[PDB]
């Protein structure tokens, strides 16, 4: 993650919505450990709010080395709906209580849609963010995903449109 | 000696009843099992000279009170798993316990429609012979084994050797 610590959270999938984030520290004293259990703000994939259906039940939920800018929850029934969340911190609008540490964390949705895919490969040895890499077409933060039916439609996040597929179990990304 | 004439009970199965560790549940802990357990305990704890009273005891009391077989298996569980103590110290009495065994056998043989559990008492007697009495009582025990039932006699025939 950002700081020199470890965090982790997921329980069952889209069925429920628990994520037991554990901010842990192990370096305490020689020949001993004191792993903490700090409860970071929990969240989930809002995709289940659809009155149509709720059967998503992800089975991968992969992460990356940048613990702020992804959430690999995805509809994984027999289903397909990729999702992506963030950690955009913001204060709450404390008002309407009268005439006129506020810092809190509430996750934000980034991108999600209905698709047709089962197995993911990898999120991103990627580049850094906060750079307008428009003219850049190398796999900077490139994201891939496998299609069940033959060819693979690997396309980076926030666009999801299409890339070169060159028309004629589990996989992973070999490299950049 | 509850009834002993019409029917003791259909649950009178000696093995399951006389078994311990059934007390682990709130059932299958009939009084007789507790009595057997306490007797085993006091006899395993007073095994120095207190066994001298069991031969006269079994002779006067326990002989003419047994017609069925579960009483026999009961008294067997009582005095049976102690023959090692007699073989160690009280060799003077082990012959008496043996002839008592054989007396119980002849008694249950004489008054019975048919025996259903030959094998248990058979290999019990076999163990007793091969482990405790060896080959001493043969000539004496013959005078008891001769006048038993034909089926029981042919079944226990191999005691002669």
């Amino acid at each position: 993650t950002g700081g020199g610590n470890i965090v982790v959270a997921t329980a069952d999938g889209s069925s429920a919505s628990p994520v037991q984030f554990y901010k842990v520290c192990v370096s305490v004293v020689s020949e001993k450990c004191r792993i903490d259990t700090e409860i970071l703000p929990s969240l989930f994939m809002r995709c289940t709010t659809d009155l149509n259906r709720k059967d998503k039940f992800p089975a991968i939920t992969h992460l990356k080395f940048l613990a702020r800018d992804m959430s690999e929850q995805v509809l994984l029934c027999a289903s397909s709906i990729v999702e992506c969340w963030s950690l955009r911190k913001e204060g709450l609008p404390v008002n309407n209580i009268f005439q006129q540490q506020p810092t809190i964390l509430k996750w934000r949705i980034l991108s999600a849609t209905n698709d047709l895919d089962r197995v993911s490969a990898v999120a991103l040895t990627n580049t850094d963010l906060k750079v307008a890499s428009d003219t850049q077409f190398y796999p900077g933060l490139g994201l891939a995903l496998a299609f069940h039916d033959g060819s693979v439609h690997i396309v980076h996040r926030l666009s999801l449109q299409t890339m070169a597929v060159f028309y004629s179990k589990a996989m992973q990304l070999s490299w950049t | 000696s509850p009834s002993l004439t019409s029917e003791t009970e259909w649950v009178g199965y000696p093995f399951r009843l006389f078994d311990f560790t059934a007390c682990h549940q709130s059932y299958s802990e009939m009084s007789c099992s507790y009595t057997l357990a306490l007797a085993h305990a006091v006899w395993h704890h007073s095994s120095i000279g207190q066994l001298s009273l069991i031969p006269k005891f079994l002779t006067e009391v326990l002989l003419p009170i047994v017609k069925t077989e579960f009483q026999l298996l009961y008294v067997y569980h009582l005095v049976g798993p102690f023959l090692q103590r007699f073989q160690q110290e009280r060799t003077r009495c082990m012959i008496e316990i043996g002839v008592a065994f054989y007396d119980m056998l002849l008694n249950v043989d004489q008054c019975s429609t048919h025996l259903n559990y030959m094998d248990p008492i058979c290999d019990f007697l076999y163990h007793m012979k091969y482990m405790f009495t060896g080959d001493s009582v043969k000539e004496q025990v013959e005078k008891i084994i001769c006048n038993l039932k034909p089926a029981l006699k042919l079944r226990l025939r191999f005691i002669t050797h």
Partner: protein, 474 residues
């Protein structure tokens, strides 16, 4: 014993499948079979239960009776149709005295209660000549203050199922006030599955129907409002007792829409905490703050109207935002809570628990909802205001037990509550999993013992259920 421990209620028609399974999927000689089944019935209610389960236990034991009745009806045919096989079976079983002594020592009256249930079964099953069997039983126990609960429960079960047989309204609240005085033994008897589903349906329909309209008689309207509140509290307690069964009996069929919001997101073996901000937050701008301010500064009680319960989420939002999130009010939030802690208001506790769960789903660094829950569990509503309930005593007990059953994560990860239950024994079934120990103990703690034991160790059954639905079948 497993079936009698998991699904005692919610019995639409499980007994049929149970009978067909125990008959076909086994090799059980009829005498030994009935001996074993009656042993299984009798061994219960001794080791595991010490509270509410005991009543449920004896209810299941006496519900095993119609099971063997349907058996005798349809198991055998023209070949010793339960004439004397069960007779000699019970005769042989009577030799199992220590079970009877254990039952007697447990109930302190189980001999008379046993005689009573025996002659009652005889009143329903065959009673040709088993009076001699009853006499032999009485002879089998020769050497060896106010009211025994099993007798009175099985007696009044009929009169409770047939309470008034008047599906109407405009009656007195005494009908439910009498039940509010007694324990949940009423629901335990109702668990006989003969009226349980039907009673739940009728009760839900009466609740959805008795919306008390809009009148001007303050006394009668307040009395009916308090009656409705107590009825909803009793319904929520019966739900928390079983869970899925109440929702199934209430949401099986019918073209309608009762108050499913407080029945599907209140409390269950499922978090649904992070979902609480999303789905149950239907707060239209129409009177969004009007009802909020009304419930905040009511102390507004012109006509009986309780619908903001499904909309108190916005009120809770404003409360948590103004109490310490902004510091606009130091102790006025406590005053508003005490106002909301007034009598005939129990749905507020549901919203409080839901938002405490939602804040547990947060960073948990503020723990303002923890203090809110602590205040809610405090002695605040000690009949200070003019609580026109007259039944808050039992209502407070229902509220306390409902608060206790949920928010367990808060009850553990934070400071202990001030014991608002004042009961006898809380729910014994819990996690019971040693935290700082690996999973390599299920065989060394359960499988090893039960092998030498003679039963399924009903206590560890729940533990095995948690382990199973926690790990993987493989």
């Amino acid at each position: 014993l497993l079936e009698g421990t998991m699904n005692l209620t919610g019995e639409t028609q499980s007994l049929v499948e149970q009978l067909t399974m125990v008959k076909r999927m086994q090799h059980i000689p009829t005498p030994l079979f009935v001996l074993e089944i009656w042993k299984a019935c009798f061994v219960g209610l001794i080791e595991s239960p010490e509270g509410t389960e005991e009543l449920k236990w004896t209810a299941f034991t006496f519900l095993k009776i119609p099971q063997v009745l349907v058996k005798l009806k349809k198991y055998s045919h023209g070949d010793k149709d339960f004439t004397e096989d069960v007779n000699c079976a019970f005769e042989f079983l009577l030799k199992l005295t220590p079970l009877l002594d254990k039952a007697d020592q447990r109930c302190n009256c189980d001999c008379t209660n046993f005689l009573l249930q025996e002659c009652g079964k005889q009143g329903l099953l065959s009673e040709a000549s088993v009076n001699n069997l009853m006499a032999k039983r009485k002879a089998d126990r020769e050497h060896a203050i106010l009211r025994a609960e099993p007798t009175v429960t099985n007696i009044l079960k009929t009169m409770d199922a047939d309470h008034s047989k008047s599906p109407e309204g405009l009656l007195g609240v005494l009908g439910h006030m009498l039940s509010g005085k007694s324990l949940d033994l009423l629901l335990a008897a109702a668990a006989a599955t003969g009226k349980l589903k039907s009673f739940a349906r009728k009760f839900i329909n009466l609740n959805e129907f008795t919306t008390y309209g809009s009148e001007e008689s303050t006394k009668p309207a307040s009395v009916r409002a308090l009656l409705f509140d107590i009825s909803f509290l009793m319904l929520c307690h019966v739900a928390q007792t079983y869970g899925s069964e109440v929702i199934l009996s209430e949401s099986r069929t019918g073209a309608e829409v009762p108050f499913f919001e407080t029945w599907m997101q209140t409390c269950m073996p499922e978090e649904g905490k992070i979902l609480n901000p999303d789905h149950p937050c239907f707060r239209p701008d129409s009177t969004k703050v009007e009802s909020l301010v009304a419930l905040l500064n009511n102390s507004k009680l012109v006509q009986m109207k309780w619908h903001e319960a499904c909309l108190s989420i916005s009120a809770a939002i404003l409360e948590i935002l103004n109490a310490w999130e902004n510091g606009v009010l130091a102790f006025e939030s406590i005053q508003k809570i005490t106002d909301n802690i007034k009598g005939k208001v129990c749905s507020l506790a549901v919203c409080a628990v839901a938002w405490l769960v939602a804040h547990v789903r947060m960073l948990g660094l503020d723990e303002r909802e923890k203090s809110l829950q602590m205040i809610r569990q405090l002695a605040g509503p000690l009949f200070s205001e003019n609580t026109l309930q007259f039944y808050n005593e039992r209502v407070v007990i229902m509220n306390s037990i409902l608060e206790r059953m949920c928010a367990d994560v808060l009850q553990q990860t934070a400071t202990q509550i001030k014991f608002p239950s004042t009961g006898v024994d809380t729910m014994p079934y819990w996690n019971l999993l040693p935290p700082k120990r690996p999973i390599k103990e299920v065989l060394t703690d359960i499988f090893a013992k039960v092998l030498e034991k003679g039963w399924v160790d009903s206590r560890s059954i729940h533990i095995f259920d948690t382990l199973l639905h926690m790990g993987g079948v493989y």
